[PDB]
């Protein structure tokens, strides 16, 4: 006796859990649709600002701080993008694995990782390991706005230009094909000047008001912010998947 | 603005008239309900007398 009672109790408990998880899966599907919509909505501004930055760099002085690498690299500010809620799978664990790979790459080159986190799961993971989190941002993992990305990018670029970091990385989950949620590490600063080709031959001359260097240095942090925002959106869609 | 003001006063007076027409049926059904209750009174008394 009393064994059948506990068995029926566990049965109804597991039934409640099953109902809740099925509802959560269908809700996550609907919200994946929403997040993909937001991503493909933010795509065009990214394309156009990339094209304008290329046009400006064509005739500019490519010696901006965000554009030249520094001898004596002592510190790289890493921004880890995790989630706030926890009913995802190995999402946060994959982010943390990629971030540890990045930290052990940065210690191989003599740089000291400075850690910025987005999400409460990264807060937990890094406070448990007695890490030093310079700044944390929470509450916008499932629907990030451009203002959150602007704040994050401004803080990161202020730390870069200055108690100062020589590189800037982002560890986030790239979302591709609705089937590939892959944790990736990107280097956002300093950018690398890559020359593709003259492409078009002799063409019309572009006018710049007031000149190309002013607009280039005004667009560079805007481009950093656009990339941070795209990373946030990709990580949100990946978290929902 | 003239039309809007006259339409406002027209709708206001019709609203008050409709308020009156409604509280009319209100008090009528109220007295009817009271009557039904007083009617139940005598039968609930006789059901115990018997």
């Amino acid at each position: 006796a009393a064994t059948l009672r506990e068995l029926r109790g566990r049965i109804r408990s597991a039934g409640s859990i099953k109902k809740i998880t099925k509802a959560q899966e269908l809700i996550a599907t609907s919200r994946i649709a929403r997040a993909q919509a937001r991503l493909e909505s933010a795509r065009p501004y990214a394309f156009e600002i990339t094209r304008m930055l290329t046009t400006l760099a064509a005739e500019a002085a490519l010696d901006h701080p965000l554009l030249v690498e520094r001898p004596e690299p002592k510190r790289a500010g890493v921004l880890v993008v995790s989630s706030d809620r926890g009913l995802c799978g190995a999402y946060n664990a994959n982010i943390f694995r990629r971030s540890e790979e990045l930290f052990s790459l940065l210690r191989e080159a003599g740089k000291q990782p400075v850690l910025y986190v987005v999400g409460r799961k990264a807060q937990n993971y890094y406070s448990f390991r007695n890490w030093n989190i310079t700044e944390s941002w929470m509450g916008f993992s499932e629907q990030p706005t451009y203002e959150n990305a602007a704040e994050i990018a401004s803080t990161l670029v202020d730390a870069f230009l200055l108690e100062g970091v020589d590189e800037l990385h982002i560890v986030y989950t790239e979302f591709k094909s609705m089937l590939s949620q892959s944790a990736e590490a990107h280097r956002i600063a300093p950018m690398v000047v890559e020359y593709v080709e003259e492409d078009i031959g002799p063409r019309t001359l572009y006018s710049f008001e007031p000149d190309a260097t002013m607009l280039f240095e005004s667009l560079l942090p805007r481009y950093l912010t656009t990339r941070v925002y795209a990373a946030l959106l990709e990580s949100a869609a990946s978290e929902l998947a | 603005l003239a039309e809007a003001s006259q339409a406002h006063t027209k709708a206001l007076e019709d609203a008050k008239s409709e308020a009156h027409r409604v509280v009319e049926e209100a008090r009528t059904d109220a007295e009817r309900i009271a009557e039904q209750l007083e009617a139940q009174a005598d039968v609930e008394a006789e059901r115990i007398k018997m």
């Binding site: - | 809007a4 406002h8 409604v22 509280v23 209100a26 109220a30 009174a41």
Partner: protein
């Protein structure tokens, strides 16, 4: 001065007219819901004293 005051008065007249237009339905619903809550005040006091007399009898 008169013509600018005229155009300003016309703008204000349109705005106030639309505002009074909305306030028409607003106060109509306000009055009729005051009326129906007064009505619902009755038919319960009647039920109240009906219950009282049924139980005292």
């Amino acid at each position: 001065r008169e013509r600018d005051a005229m155009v300003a008065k016309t703008l204000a007249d349109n705005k106030k007219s639309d505002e009074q237009f909305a306030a028409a339905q607003a106060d109509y619903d306000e009055a009729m819901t005051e009326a129906r809550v007064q009505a619902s005040s009755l038919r319960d006091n009647a039920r109240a004293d009906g219950r009282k007399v049924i139980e005292d009898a």
